[PDB]
Amino acid sequence: IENAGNRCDGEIINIGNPENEASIEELGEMLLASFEKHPLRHHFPPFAGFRVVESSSYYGKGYQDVEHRKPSIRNAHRCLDWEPKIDMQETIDETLDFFLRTVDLT
Amino acid sequence: MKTVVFAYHDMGCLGIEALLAAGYEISAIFTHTDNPGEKAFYGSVARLAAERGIPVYAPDNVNHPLWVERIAQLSPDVIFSFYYRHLIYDEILQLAPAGAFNLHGSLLPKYRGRAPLNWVLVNGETETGVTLHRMVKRADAGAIVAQLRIAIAPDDIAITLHHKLCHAARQLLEQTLPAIKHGNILEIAQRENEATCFGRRTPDDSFLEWHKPASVLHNMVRAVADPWPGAFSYVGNQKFTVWSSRVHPHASKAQPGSVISVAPLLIACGDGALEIVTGQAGDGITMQGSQLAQTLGLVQGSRLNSQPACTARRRTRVLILGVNGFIGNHLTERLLREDHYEVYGLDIGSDAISRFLNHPHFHFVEGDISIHSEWIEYHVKKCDVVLPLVAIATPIEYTRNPLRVFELDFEENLRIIRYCVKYRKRIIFPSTSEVYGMCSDKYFDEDHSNLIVGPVNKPRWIYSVSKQLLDRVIWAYGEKEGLQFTLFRPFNWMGPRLDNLNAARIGSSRAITQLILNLVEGSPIKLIDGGKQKRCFTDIRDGIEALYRIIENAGNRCDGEIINIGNPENEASIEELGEMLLASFEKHPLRHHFPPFAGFRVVESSSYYGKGYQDVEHRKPSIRNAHRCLDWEPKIDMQETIDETLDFFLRTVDLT
Amino acid sequence: DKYFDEDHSNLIVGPVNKPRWIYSVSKQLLDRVIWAYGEKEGLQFTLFRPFNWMGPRLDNLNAARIGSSRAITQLILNLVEGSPIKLIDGGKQKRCFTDIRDGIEALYRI
Amino acid sequence: VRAVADPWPGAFSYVGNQKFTVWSSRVHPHASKAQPGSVISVAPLLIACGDGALEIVTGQAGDGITMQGSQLAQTLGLVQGSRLNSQPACTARRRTRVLILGVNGFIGNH
Numbered sequence: 001i002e003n004a005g006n007r008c009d010g011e012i013i014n015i016g017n018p019e020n021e022a023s024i025e026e027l028g029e030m031l032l033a034s035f036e037k038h039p040l041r042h043h044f045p046p047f048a049g050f051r052v053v054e055s056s057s058y059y060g061k062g063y064q065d066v067e068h069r070k071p072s073i074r075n076a077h078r079c080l081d082w083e084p085k086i087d088m089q090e091t092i093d094e095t096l097d098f099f100l101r102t103v104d105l106t
Numbered sequence: 107m108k109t110v111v112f113a114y115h116d117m118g119c120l121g122i123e124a125l126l127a128a129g130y131e132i133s134a135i136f137t138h139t140d141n142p143g144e145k146a147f148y149g150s151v152a153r154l155a156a157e158r159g160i161p162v163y164a165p166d167n168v169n170h171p172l173w174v175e176r177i178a179q180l181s182p183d184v185i186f187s188f189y190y191r192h193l194i195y196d197e198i199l200q201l202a203p204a205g206a207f208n209l210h211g212s213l214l215p216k217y218r219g220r221a222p223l224n225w226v227l228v229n230g231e232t233e234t235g236v237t238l239h240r241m242v243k244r245a246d247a248g249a250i251v252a253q254l255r256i257a258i259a260p261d262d263i264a265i266t267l268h269h270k271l272c273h274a275a276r277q278l279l280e281q282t283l284p285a286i287k288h289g290n291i292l293e294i295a296q297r298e299n300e301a302t303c304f305g306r307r308t309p310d311d312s313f314l315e316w317h318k319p320a321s322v323l324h325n326m327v328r329a330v331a332d333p334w335p336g337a338f339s340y341v342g343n344q345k346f347t348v349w350s351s352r353v354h355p356h357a358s359k360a361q362p363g364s365v366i367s368v369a370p371l372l373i374a375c376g377d378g379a380l381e382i383v384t385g386q387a388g389d390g391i392t393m394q395g396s397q398l399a400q401t402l403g404l405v406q407g408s409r410l411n412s413q414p415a416c417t418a419r420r421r422t423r424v425l426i427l428g429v430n431g432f433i434g435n436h437l438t439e440r441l442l443r444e445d446h447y448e449v450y451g452l453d454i455g456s457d458a459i460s461r462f463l464n465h466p467h468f469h470f471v472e473g474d475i476s477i478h479s480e481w482i483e484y485h486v487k488k489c490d491v492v493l494p495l496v497a498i499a500t501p502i503e504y505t506r507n508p509l510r511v512f513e514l515d516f517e518e519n520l521r522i523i524r525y526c527v528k529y530r531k532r533i534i535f536p537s538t539s540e541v542y543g544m545c546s547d548k549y550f551d552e553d554h555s556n557l558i559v560g561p562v563n564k565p566r567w568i569y570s571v572s573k574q575l576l577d578r579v580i581w582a583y584g585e586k587e588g589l590q591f592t593l594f595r596p597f598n599w600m601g602p603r604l605d606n607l608n609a610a611r612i613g614s615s616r617a618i619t620q621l622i623l624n625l626v627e628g629s630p631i632k633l634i635d636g637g638k639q640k641r642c643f644t645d646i647r648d649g650i651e652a653l654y655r656i657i658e659n660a661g662n663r664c665d666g667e668i669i670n671i672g673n674p675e676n677e678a679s680i681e682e683l684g685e686m687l688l689a690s691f692e693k694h695p696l697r698h699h700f701p702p703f704a705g706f707r708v709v710e711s712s713s714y715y716g717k718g719y720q721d722v723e724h725r726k727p728s729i730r731n732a733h734r735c736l737d738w739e740p741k742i743d744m745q746e747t748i749d750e751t752l753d754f755f756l757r758t759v760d761l762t
Numbered sequence: 763d764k765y766f767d768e769d770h771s772n773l774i775v776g777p778v779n780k781p782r783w784i785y786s787v788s789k790q791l792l793d794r795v796i797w798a799y800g801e802k803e804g805l806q807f808t809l810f811r812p813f814n815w816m817g818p819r820l821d822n823l824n825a826a827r828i829g830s831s832r833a834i835t836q837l838i839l840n841l842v843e844g845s846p847i848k849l850i851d852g853g854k855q856k857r858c859f860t861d862i863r864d865g866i867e868a869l870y871r872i
Numbered sequence: 873v874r875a876v877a878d879p880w881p882g883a884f885s886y887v888g889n890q891k892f893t894v895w896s897s898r899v900h901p902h903a904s905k906a907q908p909g910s911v912i913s914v915a916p917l918l919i920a921c922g923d924g925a926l927e928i929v930t931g932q933a934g935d936g937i938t939m940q941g942s943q944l945a946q947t948l949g950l951v952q953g954s955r956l957n958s959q960p961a962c963t964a965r966r967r968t969r970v971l972i973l974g975v976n977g978f979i980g981n982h
C-alpha cells in the first residue's frame with residue numbers, strides 16, 4: 001500500500017514463508033511446552049493409537065496437489081525489501097492463547 | 107348396500123377390500139390421503155391401491171360447507187372416522203340417524219386427542235390396539251364397542267404379522283354386521299372416571315434428550331421392530347434415522363470418550379453405550395460406520411451433542427416495515443418482552459416507539475418505502491421474518507388521487523414481496539378486511555365468501571382490488587416457488603395509540619373517535635335509526651396476541667393460511683357505544699360542556715341518511731381459522747377497551 | 763344483474779384460494795388504472811368489452827389444443843368425424859353470440 | 873401392449889387434459905359392418921376402430937380405478953360416447969429450428 005517510488009505497479013508478489021515448514025507441528029513439540037499454560041481445567045493427558053492414514057487426508061487422482069505448496073518470494077524481496085521474521089513457534093502459541101481467550105471459560 | 111367411506115392407509119385398503127368382499131358396494135369415496143413424497147422410505151401405497159382399484163383423490167376445497175351438504179344428501183346412515191383431518195362442528199352433522207364410529211389407535215381414555223402411536227410409545231406404554239367408539243360431544247369418551255387384543259410374539263415375522271392382521275380382519279367382519287343387526291354390542295365395564303387430558307403434541311418434542319431416563323431407550327428398542335419410522339438423530343453435521351440398534355445392559359461409564367473398537371461402532375455415553383448399527387441419512391443408504399468415519403473425518407471420542415451452540419434461544423430477526431404505526435408499535439412491545447427476537451424497523455418517525463430506541467436490540471432506522479430500497483433489500487436479505495405493515499388508507503387518497511394507492515400500496519408491496527422470494531424469507535402480509543366489499547354474507551369467511559366490488563368507474567374500490575390482487579400473487583408465489591406466508595386480516599382493531607390526530611383509517615373504519623370527538627363540546631349526532639346498524643370491535647391487546655402467535659408458528663399451523671382476527675361476538679350499536687361512553691364519562695372531566703347537549707334525545711327523528719349508499723352495514727368476521735390455527739379466542743370485553751381508549755385519549759391530551 | 767351494465771353492475775369474484783379469478787382481477791385492476799390515469803394526467807382512452815365475438819378465423823390449435831376457447835369449434839369437429847352432440851350440464855344454458863363483422867364495425871368507429 | 877406389462881405402470885396416453893394408462897387389451901376379428909364409434913350392443917360393450925379391432929380391458933385415468941371405460945366414466949364423472957384420442961403430429965411432426973449466430977463463417981456456411 002505504501003508503494004515507495006511507484007515500484008509495486010503491475011506486480012504479482014506472493015506473500016508467504018517458503019522456509020517455515022512444519023511436519024505435523026513436530027508431533028506437538030511446542031504444544032508439549034505450551035500445554036502447561038496456567039489453568040488446570042480440562043487438562044488431562046491424551047491417549048495414543050493409529051489405524052490408517054487414509055481417514056485423515058485424501059490421496060485421490062482428481063483432488064490432489066502434485067508436489068508441494070512452497071512459494072517463491074522474489075518480487076517481495078525487491079519491491080518491498082521484505083523477508084519473513086516470525087517463525088512457527090510464536091504463531092502456534094499466540095493462536096492457541098488467543099483461541100483459549102476467545103471462548104473465555106465456558 | 108350403498109356406502110361412503112373415509113379410509114386411509116393399508117388399514118383403509120384392507121377395510122375397503124373386506125367391505126367389497128362382503129358385498130357392500132362402495133358408491134363413492136372422497137378422501138384426504140395427500141401422502142406427500144409418496145415413496146419416501148416405503149412401498150407405494152397409491153399405485154398399490156390403483157392396481158387394487160381404490161379411487162384415491164385429494165380435493166382442494168374439501169372444507170367447503172356446500173361439499174358437506176353434498177355428502178349429507180347421499181343419505182349417510184352411518185359415519186366412519188378413520189383418521190379424519192376435519193374440524194367441522196357437530197351441529198350440522200347431528201342429523202345422522204345411526205351415528206358415527208371412530209377408529210383410534212390408542213388406549214382410551216388414557217392420553218386422549220390425536221397422534222396415538224407417538225403418545226403410546228413415548229410415555230413408556232407396552233400396550234396398543236384398536237378402539238372403536240361413538241363420536242359425540244364427548245369426543246374420545248364414548249363406550250368401546252370392541253377392544254381387540256394382540257399376542258406378544260418375540261419371533262414375529264412379516265408373513266406371520268400379515269396373516270395375523272388378515273385373521274383379525276376376519277374376526278372384525280364376523281362381529282360387524284351381526285353386532286349391528288341383533289344389537290349385542292355389550293362392552294366391558296371400564297372406569298371412565300380416570301380420564302386425564304394432555305393435549306396434542308408436535309414432533310419437535312421427539313428430539314433426543316440426554317438427561318431423560320432410559321424410557322426413550324426402551325421406545326427406540328421397540329421402534330427398531332418391523333418397519334416403524336425409526337429413531338431420528340442429529341449429529342450436527344449429518345442427520346440420520348437409525349433402523350436398528352442393540353443396547354448393551356452395562357452402564358459402561360469406564361473412560362468417557364475412549365472408543366474400544368470401531369467395528370462395530372460402540373461408543374460410550376453418560377447413559378449406557380451406543381452401538382449404531384445401520385442408519386439412513388434422509389433418502390440415502392445404510393452406510394456402515396467405518397465408511398462414515400473415513401468420509402467426514404469424524405474425530406474418534408467426539409461426544410455427541412443434542413443441539414449445536416447458538417445465541418440466546420435463537421434470534422429470529424423480525425423486519426417490520428413501519429413501526430411508528432398502530433400495529434408495529436404494539437407488536438414491538440410483545441416481541442421485545444419475550445427475548446428471542448431482534449426487531450428491526452423503518453418508518454417516517456419515532457414518535458410512538460421512543461420507548462424502544464434505547465433497547466439493547468430494536469435497531470430503528472428512519473426512512474420511507476420508496477426512496478430507501480437498498481436498506482429494505484439488504485434487511486430482507488438478513489432478517490428472518492418480514493411484516494409489510496405500511497399503508498396509506500386515507501379516503502382523501504381514495505378520491506383525490508387514486509394514483510397514490512396503487513404506486514405505493516400495490517407497487518411497493520409487490521417490490522417487497524419479490525425480495526422475500528429472491529432470498530427465500532418468510533412474510534406475514536397484512537391483508538385488509540375491505541377486500542370483501544359489498545359481501546352479502548353474515549360471517550365474512552376467509553375461504554368461502556365472495557368478493558364484491560362496484561364498477562371500475564368508482565375510484566373508491568381501487569384500494570380493495572389492489573390489496574386483493576396482492577393476496578392472489580402471494581398465494582401464487584407460495585404454490586409455485588415455495589414461499590412461506592400468512593395473510594391475517596385485522597377486523598376493527600381498537601385500542602390506545604390509535605391515530606391521536608384525526609383517526610380515520612389504518613386501524614379501523616370511521617365509527618370510533620366520532621363520539622369521543624363530539625364529547626369535547628361537539629354536540630354528538632346520535633342518529634337512532636339511520637346509520638346506527640351494528641359495529642364489532644377488537645381490542646389491540648387481543649389482535650396483537652393473535653399476531654404474535656402467527657409469528658410464533660407453533661407447529662407451522664399458520665403456513666399458507668388466511669386468518670381473520672376479529673371479535674364477531676362483540677356487537678355494539680352506535681347508541682350502545684354512546685351509552686357506555688356516557689356511563690364512563692363521570693370519572694372527572696365533567697367541568698367542560700356542563701350542559702349535556704344531545705344527551706337524552708329519545709324521539710325518533712325522521713331524518714334519513716345522505717345521498718350515496720356507500721356506508722357498509724354488516725362487517726362481522728368469522729374467527730374459525732384463528733381458533734383452529736392459533737387456539738386464539740378474544741377475551742377482553744368492550745367495556746375494558748372503551749375504558750383504556752378513553753383514558754389514553756383524555757389523560758395526556760387533557761390540559762384541564 | 764340480468765344486463766351486465768358498464769357503470770351500474772357490480773363485479774363479483776370468488777375467494778383468494780381459487781387461483782382461477784386472478785385473470786378477472788388482473789384485467790379489472792388494469793381498467794381501474796387506465797381510469798385513474800385518464801383523470802389525473804388526462805389520458806385519452808376507451809375500454810371495449812367483446813363478449814362472444816366469433817367468426818371465421820377464430821382458432822384451430824389442432825382441435826383447440828385441449829379445448830381452450832371451445833365454443834363452437836368442437837361442434838364443427840363433431841360434424842365431420844361422425845360424433846354425437848354432447849350436452850354438458852344438460853344443455854339447458856342459453857348462449858348469445860356476436861358476428862365478428864358487427865364487432866369490427868363497432869370497433870372501427872371506436 | 874405386452875411390452876408395458878409388469879413391473880411398469882403401462883402404456884401412457886392423453887385425452888383432453890387427462891392422462892390415462894392402459895395395462896392390457898384384447899383383439900377382435902377384423903370383420904366389421906358398422907361405423908367406428910357407433911354403439912349397437914351394450915352387453916358386452918363393443919366399439920369399432922378405423923383399422924383392426926382392439927377392445928380395452930383395463931385402463932385408469934390419472935389416479936383412479938383400473939377398469940373398463942364405463943366404470944371409469946361413472947366414477948370420475950365423464951360421459952359415455954367419447955373416443956380415445958392419441959397425440960397428433962405423427963411422422964413429419966415439425967421441422968426442428970436451428971439458430972446459427974455467425975452463419976456466414978467457415979463452419980457456419982458449411
